[PDB]
Design a binder for this molecule. Sequence first.
Ligand SMILES: Cc1ccc2ncnc(N)c2c1
Ligand SMILES: [Cl-]
Lengths: 381, 112
Amino acid sequence: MSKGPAVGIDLGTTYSCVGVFQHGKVEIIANDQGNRTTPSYVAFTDTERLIGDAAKNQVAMNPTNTVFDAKRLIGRRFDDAVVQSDMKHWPFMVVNDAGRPKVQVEYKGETKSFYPEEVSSMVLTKMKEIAEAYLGKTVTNAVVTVPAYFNDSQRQATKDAGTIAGLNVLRIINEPTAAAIAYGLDKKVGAERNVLIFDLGGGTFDVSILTIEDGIFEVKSTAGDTHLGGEDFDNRMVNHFIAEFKRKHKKDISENKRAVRRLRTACERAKRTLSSSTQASIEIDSLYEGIDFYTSITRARFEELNADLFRGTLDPVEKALRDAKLDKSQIHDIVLVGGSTRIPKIQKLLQDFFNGKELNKSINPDEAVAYGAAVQAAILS
Amino acid sequence: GSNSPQEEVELKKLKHLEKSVEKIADQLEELNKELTGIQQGFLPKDLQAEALCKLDRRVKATIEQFMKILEEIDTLILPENFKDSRLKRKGLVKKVQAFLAECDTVEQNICQ
Ligand SMILES: Cc1ccc2ncnc(N)c2c1
Ligand SMILES: [Cl-]
């Protein structure tokens, strides 16, 4: 294979995305399964190592040996409050190796430990292979994104993950900076502009305020909730339908894991439908004890069930503005990143907070960060 | 006697699912035959527990495949007038559920 162009990779907590700037435009590259985003999952079995969709697809089968959330560990010390808190909820083992966290798994019948950058290199190897499979050319150069709050150790470890994956990391750039680059906010004529990045996706909520003066990006403030996402909105819908089944049939489906999973999957789909329709219907035959569950939910009810969570997204916005020493009227551009920003109520709440100001939302919010990184990668080529 | 072309679209998705169920049911049948073999006791007893527990990954893969079939079936919306599609969906869910209860029987007899 001949030498290909440089790529932009958004290394995410739950999913990763790879893009390429070619023919004057960014193309978001689909994986082997035809998916534009790949789960940041690595599975270790008795026979193989699985990355992405193949790793996520077998998680139920191999929960302990399926690693995810490596990004929550990368560049951190074992005794970090974040590492110690997150550990309680992971099915895989996290061990201490001289102050450093390591994931401990069973791989081909052997106990093996991996540093978070070794796990993240496996995900980066997959993104590199996804790019090569599409282009039909070798891929070496890439721009990899990191959250704006990442420290020196977290940034170095992400760069190290790229080096292990055989990538030449051209630059490491902030996720909110990548999103501002995607919308070309650094190319707009005039004085300094204040940009608010509203990132609600990949199981985290990040609000960043940037000051772009003569194309130079300055992080003024970062705020958010590290454990907020679409899964929280799904849980509210699941709870609504569990209560509804109890009211209608006087039966509790909650201790039947398969019934709860069928309902949860149906709610994830229903939530997505409610971003474009005002009603979503669900038909689940023989959900529990032979009872068919045929129901529906309106966008209004979904908004009612999640009213506190949606409104609560404005608290890190106000905190970011306060820390940046800025009034909401001083924000020139608002950018929506993450899949959950597709929710019409979230858009409505945010636009109303900014007194009817139009939102930058044209670029697919799941792909905006890889998009900006692909633009940067082409610029640095 | 008001069979619609639109219902043909639905019945085709269901038929495909029925075929997928047949392939997974064949894997379950093979697992059932292997589980039965080990139960005979021709293996050294000190090694019976490990052979039974070696069937765990396969049983779990079978369960997962049936769960993914149910999740796919659950995406279907069939109007009340699609009587034949509703009966095929119902029959298929019940068949998968009876296969899942057989998988559960295997899980209760291995790694114990
Ligand atoms: C692709 C897609 C479509 C609609 C959505 N609605 C809400 N949250 C998401 N994460 C969504 C993703
Ligand atoms: Cl593609």
